[PDB]
Amino acid sequence: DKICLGHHAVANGTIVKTLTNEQEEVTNATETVESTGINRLCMKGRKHKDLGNCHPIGMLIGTPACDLHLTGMWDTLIERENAIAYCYPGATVNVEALRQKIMESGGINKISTGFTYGSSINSAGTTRACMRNGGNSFYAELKWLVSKSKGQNFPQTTNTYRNTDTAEHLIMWGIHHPSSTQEKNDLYGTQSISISVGSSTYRNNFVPVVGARPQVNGQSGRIDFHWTLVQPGDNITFSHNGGLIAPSRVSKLIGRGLGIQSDAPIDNNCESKCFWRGGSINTRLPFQNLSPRTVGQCPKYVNRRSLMLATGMRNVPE
Amino acid sequence: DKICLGHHAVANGTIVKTLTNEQEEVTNATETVESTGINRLCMKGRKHKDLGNCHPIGMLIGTPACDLHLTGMWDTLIERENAIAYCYPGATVNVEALRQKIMESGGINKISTGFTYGSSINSAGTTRACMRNGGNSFYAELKWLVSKSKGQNFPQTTNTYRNTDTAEHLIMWGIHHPSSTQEKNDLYGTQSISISVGSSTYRNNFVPVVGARPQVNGQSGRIDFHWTLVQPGDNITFSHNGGLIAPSRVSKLIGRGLGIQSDAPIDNNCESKCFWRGGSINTRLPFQNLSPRTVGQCPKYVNRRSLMLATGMRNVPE
Amino acid sequence: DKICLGHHAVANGTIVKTLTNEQEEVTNATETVESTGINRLCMKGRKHKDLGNCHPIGMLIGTPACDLHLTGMWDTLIERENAIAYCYPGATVNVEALRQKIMESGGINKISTGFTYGSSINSAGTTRACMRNGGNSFYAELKWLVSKSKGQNFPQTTNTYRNTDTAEHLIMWGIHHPSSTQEKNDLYGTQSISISVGSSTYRNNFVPVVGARPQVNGQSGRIDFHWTLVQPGDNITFSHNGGLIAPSRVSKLIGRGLGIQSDAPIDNNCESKCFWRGGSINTRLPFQNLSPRTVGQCPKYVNRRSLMLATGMRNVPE
Amino acid sequence: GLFGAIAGFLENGWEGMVDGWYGFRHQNAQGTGQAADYKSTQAAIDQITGKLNRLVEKTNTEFESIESEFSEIEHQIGNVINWTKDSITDIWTYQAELLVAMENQHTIDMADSEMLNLYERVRKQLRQNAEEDGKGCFEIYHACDDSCMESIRNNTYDHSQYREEALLNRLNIN
Amino acid sequence: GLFGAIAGFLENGWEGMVDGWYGFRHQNAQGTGQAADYKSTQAAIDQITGKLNRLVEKTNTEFESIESEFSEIEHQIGNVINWTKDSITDIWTYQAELLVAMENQHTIDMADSEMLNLYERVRKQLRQNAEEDGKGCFEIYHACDDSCMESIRNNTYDHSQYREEALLNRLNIN
Amino acid sequence: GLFGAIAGFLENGWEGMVDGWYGFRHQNAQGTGQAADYKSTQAAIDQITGKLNRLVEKTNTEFESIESEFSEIEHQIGNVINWTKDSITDIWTYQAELLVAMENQHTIDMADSEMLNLYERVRKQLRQNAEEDGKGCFEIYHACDDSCMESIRNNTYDHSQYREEALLNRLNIN
Ligand SMILES: CC(=O)N[C@H]1[C@H]([C@H](O)[C@H](O)CO)O[C@@](O)(C(=O)O)C[C@@H]1O
Ligand SMILES: *[C@@H]1O[C@H](CO)[C@@H](O)[C@H](O)[C@H]1NC(C)=O
Ligand SMILES: *[C@@H]1O[C@H](CO)[C@@H](O)[C@H](O)[C@H]1NC(C)=O
Ligand SMILES: *[C@@H]1O[C@H](CO)[C@@H](O)[C@H](O)[C@H]1NC(C)=O
Ligand SMILES: *[C@@H]1O[C@H](CO)[C@@H](O)[C@H](O)[C@H]1NC(C)=O
Ligand SMILES: *[C@@H]1O[C@H](CO)[C@@H](O)[C@H](O)[C@H]1NC(C)=O
Ligand SMILES: *[C@@H]1O[C@H](CO)[C@@H](O)[C@H](O)[C@H]1NC(C)=O
């Protein structure tokens, strides 16, 4: 008469690593590294804004492609590839810092500047590179100041924006760089052109420079954009005589949101907290191997297909 | 007859975490994360300089608030909030890189440039924005060069500082940007104004720009400060005709020191190696949850209120 | 009659650390931290290029020291201390970005710009600062343009390089900054002087500035170097009237390579994948305390001389 | 293994026991039987559940992008960013690797120990009435029917009830 | 747990033993008694002491500030820094969490271990003169007075002195 | 230690055994002998080998330079870099220290474990024919010659062959 003690075994065991053995067979195990993502932007439960082909900088200056995105509120902001910032060609100084600022905001208010100009100034400068409603137009939030009488000198003028609010204001402006002397003279005259910008914490001067360059969207001219923050209760003064692309409205970045760059389609029916260029990640697992580039609340990226965690004893078959 | 083996137990045990159990009860446990800090700057054993309302940048240019901090030796440097850098309004290029260099030095020596100026130059330009002992004054280490005869053209002049030391020297200078044409003309004449600075390794040009702007400290004018390191044996040459705010002394950063930003009261009784905005952290514990921004030799910051490490066996009462 | 169970021991045991004991004696132990470096650059198996006293940036502009390194293919690039980038004194904007970009390339091709000049221009300007065959020369890849007609105004000229390739090209150019008014007038005339550079992505303006400066390699004049990437299909245009140091060839960075900064001797008989200023590291160990500055595939740097891993049981001698 | 039972003095596992992790096989006059021990099985399973719970707890750390997917990053800051991210990834894969290797070692050994604990409990139950096989069996020196076997598995076997008989059978004299 | 004694076959702890970590309770004709075992208690305490020393050893690494408390940080560099610091923080709170969980596991089990080791020491001392309770007790089959008890705790018990009397009692004969 | 054998109930190690890690010393009529056990020694060595294999598995990850050795780094970015590199270095040093401390604790305990497992095996093999002295020896209550000792080391000792004589000598009755 006898009684024996024992333990279970399975036909099909799983291999795991231990401190002393790279190939240990145990009765069961489970994955720790998430391998499966979602090819969609899961936006359920979030007030999101899909910018489409509007580039974030365009929201501030009013590029025609951004007309539906000049203002708004959101908790997540979605940027797509090849989005457009500039109808009339040019570039923004300190561009990435500005893009990032916008991409962590929870909305944008626009407040007018109140800038008025004398009759010798045509403040409705317009271009075929910025079409809007079938007509030549220009950046919604800016004004292309030009001499009313062609070839005549742009008058000496001064405009001051007063921030009479309780939060900082983002103001942007452009400097036009003509591609020819004729072009320069036609718009602003033969005089020496200078633009001076000054507040309590900012000062800078700009000089429009004529130069031959290839055409972008039909234009060999360039407009360079500049920006700063106007602190509450501070005034910022523009002193100019041509070449200033004047702001008609300034911006205010409201609250915080999550910035996503992705060309993945939106799904309003799934929810997520972790995003990447390729879409979304939903796991309880502490690790993932989909992307080293994620945003939100995400599992840590590791360079492994699989790390199995044992959930059973050694498997000892016979 | 029988002999029984056993272990101790206590009335009130402590809960700890293990790999397998979140609420394991043991006989004793000890905290691993420091939650308590001292609201003071423990300076015992360290030669420190409290800068009060003097800003580290002001030490180099000689703002009145920094008159007792133009030179010295220290192993710890304390910067306070709202410290004053500028008496006459302005800004420094690469201010943060400069502030950091100063805030990790172990002292500052000052050395005269020996600059002299001809009779047509008033090198004692003065302003009510920089009061000293009841009189209009200026930055102690700099000279505001102005035409001796009001309205006349500031003469073309050259000044060369020679580093004859065995260590590099930090030279600072300023560029005056008048608030109006009348003022610019009064100070430097009607001529075109240019400022060239050139050493063996550095070269740059500067042009004073007139521009309307708000009054800071009662002044709408501005001074822009620039700096470079002059290597030993090298010369640096200033070539100018108005608008140069010239160095009369040059700095040398000496050794190494720990810089702190805190408005916490100094305590010479206690010692510490770790500081943050809110004071000092003294612990033997490897982790803390006070702040992610600390300087010195500190416990690592962790996002947990408590992590109890067991110092006793499983508690089993009955 | 009896049989006894036991384990071995040794006379001299090694000390190790455990969770509970800082001084535990075990029978054997092995090091986990590599302390031994190789005093050579182990280049076996790799197609390298030792730049010697040629600085990587000198490769693009063609400094005499870099004559043997104007083109080539490599998978590892070796830069040495005090390597020369400039013969005529000057500096390069965004220099570290450029150096790094060259140091991670796997080769360089040079393609002619095809720039041609009117008879009023001497394009064969030359200097005692750049010597070849013991005589006055210049940067191999650039041309110092100067009025053939001394004192006479440099003609207003335009030059355009068009990139007809499927890959981006690195274009560099210089801007001359003379050390005197006379030097200026002799070289380019008495006129105002501007250099305008524009592509679809890049535009900038440059003005030569006269300034007294210390002599470097015999010269108090300077040349500022500038660069961009010209994208495939794009043209870039130089408009100028004196002071442009023009590109005669353009660079194309090929493939990827490992950049090493070290003065260690080259060894072609040893192999390696980990390098630092002092040479190579060959180990199987996961850690090393040689240097916190390594390149390639390296063990992780650690702040310890030794961390012994037990490879045996407790030593219990008798 | 650490505790000597599983893959130790126990020859192999029992595929035909899907009832639990540890258990009993007996032999008597009435033939054979098999039954899983619930207490030891839950003790092990509970510990594994504990680890799984720790694997799955999440930090609330929101991260933003520092690398534009669609525009160029300045070269130098870009290289610093690459170095940092890669350094961090190296740490996490190292951490991930070590967590799994360490946890699995412990998981295997605690499973070994729970088996031993069950064995040991049975050993002291029988005290002087049985002897050890060396293979995880107890040769019982008295008649143990199916009710007697059950009393052992259920921790109610009174050794004093059979001691007299068992002693005689172990000393081989009657 | 791992070794089966603490929270195992020992049903509970002794709140009344404030003298040490492990110890003895006895019962003979003179009555009862309690004494703590010094060696076993100390073996455990010195191991705890070791972990606390490792916990409290400090690294020498001095850090400077890279974030200004009082003046603005440029936006891009500021984002890089926040990303780097949060990533470093997550690593450290992970490590701290792991260290405690792992160490606690080991601490609990080694204390169980020292308890078991004491138990085993006594078992072999008594060899054939005592039998196991199953509850951490040994039933001694001879007259064990307060000096005999003491010699057991003091590791000087000579089993051969009592073996004859003990065996006859275990066999239940004269 | 954890398993009570090495630096435990075994007084000390044997310097004269360069033949292996664990083994046997016997005393009989024909004298003394010493033989190492292969199977137990190799279980331990194989496990050290596994640890060394993990230590040495290489997971790079090429890194490029982010600090020029031969030219100046802009100061602010340089401080960020310094703070980052030192932070990562503190992390790796901490892990290197933890790895070694942790692995070493497990290494010595597993060695102690393998020693106990050999001991237990011998105990169960000899079952009722021998008694433990508490110092790691088995007093054998029957005549055991070289062929008999060699059978104990070989794991072929047949207890049923010597039991009668052995019970006779142990019990000193019948
Ligand atoms: C160098 C000099 O002459 N300083 C004068 C300045 C400057 O003209 C303006 O500050 C420039 O903005 O103005 C004052 O009102 C001042 O600040 O006290 C009077 C003073 O004599
Ligand atoms: C801005 O302008 C208003 C009205 O001109 C004035 O009251 C206010 O003080 C100005 N603010 C500053 C900072 O100068
Ligand atoms: C600096 O100037 C002195 C004369 O004032 C001269 O001897 C020395 O060579 C100069 N140094 C350089 C680097 O030009
Ligand atoms: C470059 O120039 C060629 C000929 O001058 C022209 O055909 C081509 O369109 C130009 N490309 C761009 C991008 O301007
Ligand atoms: C950073 O890494 C990415 C991914 O490997 C690479 O494409 C990019 O070129 C790197 N940036 C730099 C500046 O090397
Ligand atoms: C960095 O983080 C702090 C909060 O810890 C935040 O206030 C600051 O704005 C962040 N910096 C940037 C550039 O977003
Ligand atoms: C970074 O650390 C190195 C090494 O200690 C030091 O030499 C260098 O000056 C540091 N950089 C800054 C900007 O402090």
Both tokens of B41, joined, read: 């700057």
The yes or no reply on domain C47-264 and CATH 3.90.209.20 is yes
Q: Cα(C226)–Cα(C243) distance, rounded to whole angstroms?
A: 13
3 state SS of B65: helix
Q: Which of E38, E102, E107, E165 to mutate to test the interface with B (most CBs of B within 10 A)?
A: E107
**Half-sphere exposure (CA, 13 Å, Cβ side) for E150?**
3
Residues near F41 by beta carbon (within 8 Å), at least 6 away in sequence: F20, F21, F22, F23
For C313, nearest residue in chain F (alpha carbons): F108
Task: For residue B181, give the nearest of B157, B208, B155, B205 by alpha carbon.
Answer: B208
CA distances from B50 to A136, B106, B265, C304, F48 (A): 62, 13, 10, 36, 57
Q: Distance between CA atoms of E101 and B311, rounded to whole angstroms?
A: 13
Q: Does residue A293 contact residue D67 with C-beta atoms inside 8 Å?
A: yes
Short-list B265, B259, B295, B266, CA closest to B99: B259
Task: State the amino acid at position C181 in one-letter form.
Answer: T
Residues B274-283 as b/e (b if ≥16 CB within 10 A, e otherwise) read: bbbbbbbbeb
β-strands B169-177, B135-137: how paired? unpaired
Planar angle of CA C310, C315, C316, nearest 5 degrees: 160
Q: Is C205 in the pocket of ligand 4 (CB under 6 A)?
A: no
Resolution value, angstrom units: 2.4
In one-letter notation, the amino acid at residue E137 is C
Residue from F82, F86, F88, F89 to probe ligand 7 pocket by mutation (most atoms less than 8 Å from CB): F82
Contacts 24+ apart (CB under 8 A), A274-281: A274/A298, A274/A299, A275/A41, A276/A37, A277/D69, A278/A37, A278/A39, A279/A37, A279/A38, A279/A39, A279/A40, A279/A41, A279/A42, A280/A37, A280/A38, A280/A40, A280/A41, A280/A42, A281/A34, A281/A37, A281/A38
Q: Distance between CA atoms of E151 and E28, rounded to whole angstroms?
A: 14
Q: Give residues after which chain E gaps, C-N over 2.5 angstroms.
A: none
Closest CA to A245 of A108, A106, A144, A107: A144
Q: How far apart are CA B72 and CA A284, in angstroms?
A: 57
CA distances from A200 to B90, B215, C71 (A): 9, 7, 52
Indicate the pairing of strand A244-247 with strand A169-177: antiparallel
| Mutate which: D6, D88, D160, vs E, most E CBs within 10 A | D88
Q: Which ligand is nearest to the CA of C160?
A: 4
| Nearest residue (CA) to ligand 3, atom 14 | C214
Q: Which residues contact B144 (CB under 8 A, 6 or more apart)?
A: B123, B124, B125, B126, B127, B138, B176, B245
> Residue B63 corresponds to which tokens in the numbers above?
């703002």
Please indicate whether residue F155, judged by its CB atom, sits closer than 6 Å to ligand 7: no
Q: Is residue A231 within 6 Å of ligand 2 at its C-beta?
A: no
Neighbours of chain E (3+ CB pairs under 8 A): A, B, C, D, F
Is the CB–ligand 6 distance for residue E89 below 6 Å?
no
Record the tokens describing residue A32, joined without a space. Answer: 């720790």
d(CA B13, CA B311): 11
What is the distance in A from the centroid of ligand 2 to the CA of A236? 10
- Per domain, the residue ranges of chain F are 1-174
Nearest by Cα to C68 from C49, C44, C94, C45: C49
Round the CA-based radius of gyration of chain F to a whole number and report it: 27
Please, after which residues is chain C broken with C–N above 2.5 Å? none
**Largest Cα–Cα distance of chain B, in whole Å?**
119
Nearest CA to ligand 6 atom 8: E78
Q: Start-end ranges of CATH 3.90.209.20 in chain A? A: 47-264
Q: Does C237 touch chain A (CB under 8 A)?
A: yes
Contact between chains at A100 and E90 (C-beta distance less than 8 A): no
CA distance linking residue B15 with residue B12, whole number of Å: 10
Write out the CATH class of domain D1-174: alpha beta
Give contacts of D132 with chain F, Cβ < 8 Å.
124, 127
Residues of D in contact with A4 (CB under 8 A): 24-26, 133, 135-138
Superfamily the domain B1-46+265-318 falls into: Hemagglutinin Chain A, Domain 2 (2.10.77.10)
Q: Is F84 in the pocket of ligand 7 (CB under 6 A)?
A: no
B150 alpha carbon, closest ligand: 1
Backbone angles phi, psi at A87, to 5 degrees: -75, -60
C261: distance to nearest CA of chain B, Å? 22
Method: X-ray
What is the DSSP-derived secondary structure letter of residue F9?
I
Residue C134 beta carbon below 6 angstroms from any ligand 3 atom: no
Please name which of D26, D40, D14, D44 lies closest in space to residue D151, comparing C-alpha atoms.
D26
Ligand 7 neighbour F82 (Cβ under 6 A): yes
Beta-strand (E) ranges in B80-185? 90-92, 107-112, 121-125, 127-132, 135-137, 142-147, 157-162, 169-177
Whole-number Å distance, alpha carbon C142 to ligand 4 midpoint, is 24
DSSP A38-67: BSSEE-TTS-EEE-TTB-HHHHHHT-GGGG
Bridge partners (DSSP) of residue A308 are: A31
